[PDB]
Amino acid sequence: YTYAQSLITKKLAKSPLFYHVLQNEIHLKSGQELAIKKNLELLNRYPNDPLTIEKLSDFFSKMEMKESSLVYENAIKKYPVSTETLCLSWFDNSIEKYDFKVFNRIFMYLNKKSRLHTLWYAFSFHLLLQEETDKASLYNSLGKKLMEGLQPFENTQEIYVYTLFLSSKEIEQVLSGVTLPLDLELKLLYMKAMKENASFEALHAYTEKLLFKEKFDDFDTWKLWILSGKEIGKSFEELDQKLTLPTRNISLLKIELDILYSRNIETSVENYYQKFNTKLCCYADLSQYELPTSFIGSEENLITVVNNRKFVNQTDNWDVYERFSTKEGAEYDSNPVNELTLRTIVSDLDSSPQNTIKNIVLLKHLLEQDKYNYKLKLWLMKLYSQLNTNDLIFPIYNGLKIRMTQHETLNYYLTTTNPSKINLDAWVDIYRFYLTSKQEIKESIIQGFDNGVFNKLEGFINFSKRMQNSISLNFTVAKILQISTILGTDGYLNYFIHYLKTNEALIVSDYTDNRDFKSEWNGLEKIDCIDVPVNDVATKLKLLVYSIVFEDQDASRLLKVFNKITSNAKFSVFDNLLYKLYFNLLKITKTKLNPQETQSLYNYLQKNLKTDKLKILIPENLLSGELTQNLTNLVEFIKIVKLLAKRHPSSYMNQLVNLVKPFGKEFKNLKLVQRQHEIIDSMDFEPPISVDISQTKLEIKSSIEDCVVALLNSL
Amino acid sequence: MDSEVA
Amino acid sequence: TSIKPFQMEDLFELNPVNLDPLTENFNVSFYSQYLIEWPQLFYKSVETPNGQASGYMMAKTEGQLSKKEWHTHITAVTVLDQYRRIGLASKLCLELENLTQVKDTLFIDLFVKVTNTLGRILYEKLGYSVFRRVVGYYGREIQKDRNKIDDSVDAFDMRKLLPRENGEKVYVLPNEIVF
Numbered sequence: 047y048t049y050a051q052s053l054i055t056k057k058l059a060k061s062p063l064f065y066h067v068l069q070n071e072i073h074l075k076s077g078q079e080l081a082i083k084k085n086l087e088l089l090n091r092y093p094n095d096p097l098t099i100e101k102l103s104d105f106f107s108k109m110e111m112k113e114s115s116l117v118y119e120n121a122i123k124k125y126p127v128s129t130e131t132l133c134l135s136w137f138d139n140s141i142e143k144y145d146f147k148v149f150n151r152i153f154m155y156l157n158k159k160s161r162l163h164t165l166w167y168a169f170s171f172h173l174l175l176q177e178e179t180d181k182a183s184l185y186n187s188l189g190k191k192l193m194e195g196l197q198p199f200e201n202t203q204e205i206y207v208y209t210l211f212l213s214s215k216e217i218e219q220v221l222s223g224v225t226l227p228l229d230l231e232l233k234l235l236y237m238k239a240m241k242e243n244a245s246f247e248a249l250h251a252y253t254e255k256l257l258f259k260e261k262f263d264d265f266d267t268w269k270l271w272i273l274s275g276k277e278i279g280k281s282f283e284e285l286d287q288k289l290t291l292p293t294r295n296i297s298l299l300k301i302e303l304d305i306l307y308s309r310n311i312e313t314s315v316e317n318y319y320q321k322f323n324t325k326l327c328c329y330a331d332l333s334q335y336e337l338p339t340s341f342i343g344s345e346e347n348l349i350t351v352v353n354n355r356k357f358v359n360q361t362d363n364w365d366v367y368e369r370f371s372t373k374e375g376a377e378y379d380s381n382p383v384n385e386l387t388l389r390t391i392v393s394d395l396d397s398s399p400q401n402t403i404k405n406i407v408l409l410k411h412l413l414e415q416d417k418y419n420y421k422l423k424l425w426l427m428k429l430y431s432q433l434n435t436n437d438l439i440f441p442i443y444n445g446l447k448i449r450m451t452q453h454e455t456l457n458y459y460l461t462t463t464n465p466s467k468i469n470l471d472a473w474v475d476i477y478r479f480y481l482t483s484k485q486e487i488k489e490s491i492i493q494g495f496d497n498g499v500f501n502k503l504e505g506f507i508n509f510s511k512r513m514q515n516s517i518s519l520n521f522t523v524a525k526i527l528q529i530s531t532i533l534g535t536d537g538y539l540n541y542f543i544h545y546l547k548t549n550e551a552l553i554v555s556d557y558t559d560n561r562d563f564k565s566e567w568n569g570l571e572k573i574d575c576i577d578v579p580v581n582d583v584a585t586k587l588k589l590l591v592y593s594i595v596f597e598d599q600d601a602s603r604l605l606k607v608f609n610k611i612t613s614n615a616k617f618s619v620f621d622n623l624l625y626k627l628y629f630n631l632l633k634i635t636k637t638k639l640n641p642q643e644t645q646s647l648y649n650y651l652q653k654n655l656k657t658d659k660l661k662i663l664i665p666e667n668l669l670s671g672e673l674t675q676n677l678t679n680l681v682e683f684i685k686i687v688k689l690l691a692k693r694h695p696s697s698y699m700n701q702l703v704n705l706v707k708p709f710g711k712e713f714k715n716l717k718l719v720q721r722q723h724e725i726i727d728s729m730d731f732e733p734p735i736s737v738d739i740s741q742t743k744l745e746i747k748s749s750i751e752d753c754v755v756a757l758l759n760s761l
Numbered sequence: 762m763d764s765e766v767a
Numbered sequence: 768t769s770i771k772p773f774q775m776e777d778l779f780e781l782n783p784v785n786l787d788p789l790t791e792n793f794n795v796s797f798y799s800q801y802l803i804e805w806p807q808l809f810y811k812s813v814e815t816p817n818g819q820a821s822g823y824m825m826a827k828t829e830g831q832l833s834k835k836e837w838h839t840h841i842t843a844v845t846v847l848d849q850y851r852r853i854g855l856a857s858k859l860c861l862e863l864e865n866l867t868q869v870k871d872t873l874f875i876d877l878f879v880k881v882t883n884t885l886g887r888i889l890y891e892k893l894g895y896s897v898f899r900r901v902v903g904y905y906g907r908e909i910q911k912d913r914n915k916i917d918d919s920v921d922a923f924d925m926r927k928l929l930p931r932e933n934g935e936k937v938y939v940l941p942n943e944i945v946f
C-alpha cells in the first residue's frame with residue numbers, strides 16, 4: 047500500500063499525467079475519504095480528456111454515489127471529435143457497473159448518425175419503460191418516432207423494436223403489411239395482436255395457412271384456429287371434418303373443441319386415452335381438464351399402469367414395483383415405475399427420524415437400478431438434509447453433474463454440508479462460476495447490441511440482473527467465509543472480505559431468488575413436506591457480521607442494519623441468542639462505548655457463554671440436522687471471538703477468550719454421538735420391500751460420528 | 762542515511 | 768406441443784430437462800452466443816397447461832461453402848422424460864430443416880455419444896448417417912491414436928444431406944475437425 051503511494055508521487059512528480067493523479071487520489075481514498083472525493087471533484091472540474099482517465103473517474107464517482115455521468119458528458123461536449131469512442135467506453139463501463147438505467151442517456155449523445163445506433167436509442171426507450179408511469183407516454187412516443195424514421199425496415203429485429211411501442215391494433219396493421227418473411231417471434235405476436243383485437247376472420251385465415259398448408263402443428267396455434275372459427279360462425283362439423291390425422295395435438299384439440307361448443311367431453315377424452323395410454327405424457331395432458339366421472343371408472347404395459355394409478359391417485363404402489371423393479375430399456379433412461387415409487391415415498395414422509403432413515407434406504411435401493419434418476423437423487427439429498435449426515439450430500443450433487451447456471455438454481459441442496467476443506471474448495475469453485483458468468487454475460491450484452499439482436503437483449507439484461515445479487519450468490523460467499531474461518535485456512539478469506547467491503551450496497555439490499563424448488567416435484571402434486579433447511583435472513587446477517595468485523599472506519603451504519611434485521615427476525619430460540627451474542631460482541635469490539643455500557647454488554651456475553659446456557663442449541667430430536675447446523679454456527683462464533691480479541695485486544699476480550707476454552711470437552715461429555723447411535727440402534731424397520739437396512743444404518747452412523755466429532759474438535 | 766525511495 | 772423462441776432466462780427453469788444425464792449444461796457464454804448469432808435456431812417446446820419447457824433445439828450454421836462444408840449443426844436437443852416417445856424430438860429436428868436459414872445449407876451435423884442408444888435411433892429414423900467416429904470427443908483425456916477407440920467417450924458425427932461417406936469406421940480426432 048504505502049510503497050504504491052510513494053510510487054504514485056514519483057509519477058506525479060515526473061508528470062510535473064491525469065491518469066496517474068487519479069490513481070493517487072484513489073490510493074488516498076483507500077488509505078483514508080473526504081480528501082479523495084475533493085481530489086476527484088477537483089479532477090472532474092478539470093476537463094477530463096483521456097479515455098482511461100475518464101473511465102477511472104466515472105468508476106470513482108459510482109463508488110462514492112451523479113458525478114460519474116457528468117465526467118463523460120463533459121468530455122463528449124468539449125471534444126465531439128471522439129464522441130463515439132467516449133460513448134462506447136461509457137457504454138461498456140456502464141454494463142459492467144450493472145448500471146442499465148443510464149443507457150438511454152448514452153444512446154442519445156451517441157445518436158446526435160448510425161442506423162444501428164438509432165436502433166440502440168429506440169430500444170433503450172423500451173428498456174426505460176420497463177421501470178415511472180408519469181413519463182411513460184413521452185418515452186413510448188419518442189421511441190416510436192425513432193423507428194418510423196428508419197422505414198422501410200430491413201429485418202425482423204427492426205420490426206420487433208417498432209412493435210415495442212405499438213398498440214395491439216397498430217401491431218396487427220403493421221405486421222399484416224410486412225413484405226419480409228416473419229420470424230417465429232413475430233408470427234406469435236401477430237397472432238397475439240389479432241386475438242386481442244378480435245380480428246377473428248383474419249386470425250382464422252392466418253392460422254389455417256400455418257396449420258394446414260405449412261403443417262406447422264403448433265398446439266397454441268390450433269387453439270386459436272378453433273376459437274377464430276366459432277367466432278366467425280363455423281360449426282363443430284366443418285372444423286372437425288378438417289381434423290383427420292391422429293396426432294397428439296389434434297386428439298387433445300378435439301377435447302378443447304368439445305369444450306368450446308359445450309358438447310360432451312367423454313368420447314373425445316376416451317379416444318385420447320386409448321391412443322396415448324402407452325405414453326408417459328398421458329396423465330399430464332388429460333389432468334388439464336375436468337375429466338368425467340365415468341372415465342375414472344375404467345397390465346402388460348408399465349406406462350399404462352403408471353398413468354392409470356396416477357389417475358386414480360393411488361398412494362400405495364409397491365405391488366407394481368416388484369413387477370417392474372428390473373431396469374430395462376436404454377441405459378441412460380429412467381425407470382417409469384419410479385414415478386409411482388417416488389409418489390408413495392413422498393406420501394409416507396412424516397419428518398420423524400425413523401421414517402427419514404427408512405425412506406433413505408428405499409431411495410438408495412431404487413437408485414441401485416435406476417442409476418440416473420434425478421428426482422430420486424434430489425429427494426435423497428432432501429432427506430439427508432434432515433439429519434446430521436452432512437458429508438453424504440456432496441457426492442449426490444456432483445454425480446448429477448451440476449455445473450454452471452445450475453449452481454445458481456440448485457446449490458441450496460448443499461445448505462447442510464459440513465465445513466471440510468474439500469467442501470470449501472467446492473464452494474470456491476462455485477464462486478468461480480459466478481465470476482466467469484458475470485464477465486460472459488457482460489460481453490454477451492455488448493455483442494448483442496453490436497449485432498442487432500434486440501429479440502434477446504432484454505433476456506440478457508434480466509439474466510445479468512438476476513445474477514448480480516442473488517441469495518444463491520450470497521449464500522456461496524457466506525459459506526466460504528464460514529468454512530474458511532472455521533478451519534485455519536485463509537487462502538481466499540481476504541479476497542471475500544474485499545468483496546463485502548466493495549459491495550456493501552448489495553449486501554444490505556434484498557437478494558434475488560432464482561432457486562429451483564420445483565424440479566423434484568415434476569409429475570407430482572406439490573404437497574407440504576420436508577424442506578431443505580434454508581435460512582436466508584441468517585445468510586444476510588452472517589455477511590453483515592463479517593462486514594462489521596473488518597470495518598475499519600465506522601461500524602455504526604452496518605450495525606443499525608444488523609439490529610433492524612434481527613429485531614424482525616423470526617428465529618428459533620438459539621438463533622435469537624446467537625445474533626444477540628454477535629450484536630454485543632461486535633459493539634464491544636467495534637464501537638466507542640463508555641466503561642459502563644461495555645460492562646453491561648460484557649456481562650451478557652459473560653452470562654451466556656456457558657455450556658449450561660448454550661445447551662439449548664441441542665434439539666430434542668438428537669438425530670435432527672439442527673444439531674450440527676447450530677454447532678457449526680457456535681464454532682464460527684467462537685472463532686470470531688478469537689479473531690476479534692487479536693484485532694481489537696482488550697482485557698474484556700481476554701476474559702471471553704478464556705471463557706470459551708472448556709466448551710470442547712464439555713460438549714464432548716454430552717455424548718451427542720453415542721445418544722444418536724443408541725436411538726438408531728433401537729429402531730425397528732418393517733420396509734415395504736426386501737432391502738438391506740444394515741449398510742445404510744452403518745453408513746449413517748459413521749457419517750454422524752464424523753461430522754459431530756469434527757465440529758466438537760473445532761470448539 | 763538516505764531513504765528507501767531513491 | 769407448442770414451439771416458442773428461446774430466451775436466456777429459460778436457463779433458470781431448465782433443470783427438469785438439463786438434469787438428464789445425457790444433457791450438457793453449458794457456460795452462460797455459450798448459450799448467449801448462440802442466441803446472438805443464430806437466434807432463430809434456438810427454440811423450445813412448451814407444455815399445454817403451464818408453459819413448462821418440454822425440450823429445446825440449440826443449433827448453429829458454420830463452415831466454408833468453397834470447401835463444400837457449409838452446414839447447420841445441432842449442438843443440443845433433449846426432451847423432458849415425461850414427453851418422450853411421442854414425436855417431440857423428431858418434431859424439433861424436422862422443424863429445423865424447415866427454416867429458410869437451414870435450407871440455405873448443404874447438410875446437418877451433430878455429435879452423439881456412441882453409448883447413447885436413443886439418440887442414435889432418433890437420427891437413424893430421421894435419415895442421418897454416420898460420417899465419422901470422433902475419438903475421445905466426450906472424454907477428458909486428449910489422445911493421439913485414433914485407433915484407441917472407447918465407446919464411453921467417443922462420438923459419432925452424423926450428417927443428413929439437404930436439398931441444396933459410408934463408414935462408421937473413419938476414426939478422427941477432435942482437433943482435426945476445424946471448419
Ligand SMILES: CC(C)(COP(=O)(O)OP(=O)(O)OC[C@H]1O[C@@H](n2cnc3c(N)ncnc32)[C@H](O)[C@@H]1OP(=O)(O)O)[C@@H](O)C(=O)NCCC(=O)NCCS
Nearest residue numbers: 789844845846851852853854855856857885886888889892
Ligand atoms: C430421450 C429421447 C428418446 C427423446 O426423444 P423423443 O422426442 O421421445 O423421440 P420420439 O419419441 O419422437 O421418437 C423418435 C424415434 O426414436 C425411437 N425411439 C425413441 N425413444 C425410444 C425408446 N425408449 N426405445 C426405442 N426406440 C425409441 C422411435 O422409434 C422413434 O421413431 P419411430 O417411433 O418412428 O420408429 C431422445 O431422443 C432424446 O432426445 N434424448 C435427449 C438427450 C440424449 O440422449 N441425446 C441428445 C440428442 S444427441
